Design a protein around this ligand. Structure first.
Ligand code: HEM
Length: 153
């Protein structure tokens, strides 16, 4: 469990992320797709994108980046009390989208990388540690739901 001090570090940088959700969403999805190409295959709507330039020019990709970050922000602001927000997500990602937990680990790495490049002053080692812990909590909770449903993997 994250301490009150750790949540403060997480939410402080997230407030900055909310200043430009669309730009952040783009950077994160593009990093995910370039670093782990297999993740792009899960998206019928993005499968046609072959270069970073094409990804950067896609308004649909930008719009969906807002979708991911808005859902994640709703979860982070619950400070661990995210049962109602996480349930629907785990259900859809395990049974409909078929996203293995490993991919959630990949997107967490992308999020951390982007926050570091855009918010150095508010994302030192202490904040990086807190953010990693918050993302691991998210993954641990999703993992349990996956196991219940028979998708642990
Ligand atoms: C922090 C991580 C994530 C969050 C908060 C998140 C959130 C969402 C949300 C809110 C939707 C909308 C409704 C729904 O279908 O449940 C969605 C759809 C989807 N997500 Fe994610 N997601 C995450 C990670 C991922 C990852 C890592 C992948 C794939 C590697 C993925 C693949 C999908 C797909 C395939 C859809 C549907 C796309 C479509 O409608 O065409 N998600 N996600």
């Amino acid at each position: 469990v994250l301490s009150e001090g750790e949540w403060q570090l997480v939410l402080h940088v997230w407030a900055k992320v909310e200043a430009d959700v669309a730009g952040h969403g783009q950077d994160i999805l593009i990093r995910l797709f370039k670093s782990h190409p297999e993740t792009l295959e899960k998206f019928d709507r993005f499968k046609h994108l072959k270069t970073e330039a094409e990804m950067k020019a896609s308004e649909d990709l930008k719009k969906h980046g807002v979708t991911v970050l808005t859902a994640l922000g709703a979860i982070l602001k619950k400070k661990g009390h995210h049962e109602a927000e996480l349930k629907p997500l785990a259900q859809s990602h395990a049974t409909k989208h078929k996203i293995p937990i490993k991919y959630l680990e990949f997107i967490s790495e992308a999020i951390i990388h982007v926050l570091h490049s855009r918010h150095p002053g508010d994302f030192g080692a202490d904040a990086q540690g807190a953010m990693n812990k918050a993302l691991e909590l998210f993954r641990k909770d999703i993992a349990a739901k996956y196991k219940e449903l028979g998708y642990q993997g």
